[PDB]
Design an enzyme around this catalytic site. Structure first.
Site, PDB file in Angstrom:
ATOM      1  N   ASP A 173      -0.628   5.003   0.821  1.00 34.46           N
ATOM      2  CA  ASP A 173      -1.055   6.009   1.780  1.00 34.46           C
ATOM      3  C   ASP A 173      -1.095   5.466   3.196  1.00 34.46           C
ATOM      4  O   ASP A 173      -1.788   4.487   3.490  1.00 34.46           O
ATOM      5  CB  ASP A 173      -2.421   6.572   1.394  1.00 34.46           C
ATOM      6  CG  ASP A 173      -2.403   7.272   0.070  1.00 34.46           C
ATOM      7  OD1 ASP A 173      -1.610   8.217  -0.085  1.00 34.46           O
ATOM      8  OD2 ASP A 173      -3.157   6.856  -0.836  1.00 34.46           O
ATOM      9  N   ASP A 223       0.845  -1.194   0.000  1.00 37.21           N
ATOM     10  CA  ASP A 223       0.000   0.000   0.000  1.00 37.21           C
ATOM     11  C   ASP A 223       0.882   1.246   0.000  1.00 37.21           C
ATOM     12  O   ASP A 223       2.050   1.187   0.385  1.00 37.21           O
ATOM     13  CB  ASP A 223      -0.879  -0.009   1.244  1.00 37.21           C
ATOM     14  CG  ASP A 223      -1.799   1.184   1.303  1.00 37.21           C
ATOM     15  OD1 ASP A 223      -2.457   1.452   0.277  1.00 37.21           O
ATOM     16  OD2 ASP A 223      -1.827   1.856   2.357  1.00 37.21           O
TER      17      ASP A 223
HETATM   18 MG   LIG Z   1      -3.191   2.948   3.333  1.00 33.89          MG
END
Ligand SMILES: [Mg+2]
Length: 226
Positions: A14, A12
């Site tokens: 963010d 991932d």
């Molecule tokens: Mg995230």
């Protein structure tokens, strides 16, 4: 379940590699407070990992904001564009990615962020993101829904050549929606949650850590740090 060896890693962006969740938080808090509502951790837990329009609709419905998802995305994105470039790498992120690279371990990025937002967030970090084997964004045509739908991770895994079995993929996530997407994809997942997330939302991953600095690659059959 005990950790099993893996060959391919999926990250991932963010809140996991970049500290962008604080930027979303300040902007949504400002907007929510106009309406005497608090952009709280329980709400954040629902929307991290969602595409922008999906997240906006959830904020609107849960906090009963008097706007459309399109209006909320437009306003928030206008504000966020000014601050996204200030995003910084999370602790341990550089160390881990450079280590994987040295040892030729394939890894990729799978983020619900759209193209423009990705470009802005990575303004100061193009050399870091250049190290990824490939990147799947939230506006990818193959990906209809955000996390916890597994499609973004399935799509990402299928683009390695040769593609691994999903069970040999390891996801790294900060968000409960991302943990659920990884599990739904048949993948193991390391969670690095903010400590404000609830116990119920931080006890589902294969491994839960306070920081990427605490990740021991050998636990998943990868080379130890030098
Ligand atoms: Mg995230």
């Amino acid at each position: 379940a005990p950790p099993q060896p893996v060959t391919h890693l999926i990250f991932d962006m963010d809140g996991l590699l970049l500290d962008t969740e604080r930027l979303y938080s300040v902007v949504f808090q400002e907007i929510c407070n106009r309406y005497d509502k608090k952009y709280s951790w329980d709400v954040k837990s629902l929307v991290m990992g969602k595409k922008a329009l999906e997240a906006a609709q959830i904020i609107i419905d849960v906090l009963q904001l008097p706007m459309s998802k399109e209006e909320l995305v437009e306003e928030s994105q206008t504000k966020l564009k000014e601050v996204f470039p200030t995003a910084a790498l999370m602790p341990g992120a550089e160390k881990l990615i450079i280590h994987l690279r040295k040892h030729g371990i394939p890894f990729a990025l799978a983020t619900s962020s759209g193209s423009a937002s990705f470009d802005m967030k990575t303004s100061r970090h193009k050399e870091f993101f250049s190290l990824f084997s490939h990147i799947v964004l939230g506006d990818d045509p193959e990906v209809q829904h955000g996390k916890p739908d597994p499609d973004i991770f399935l799509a990402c895994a299928k683009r390695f050549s040769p593609p691994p079995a999903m069970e040999k993929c390891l996801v790294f996530e900060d968000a409960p929606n991302g943990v659920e997407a990884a599990l739904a994809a048949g993948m193991q997942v390391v969670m690095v949650p903010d400590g404000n997330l609830s116990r119920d939302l931080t006890t589902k991953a294969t491994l839960v850590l306070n920081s990427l600095q605490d990740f021991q690659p050998e636990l998943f059959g990868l080379p130890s740090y030098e």
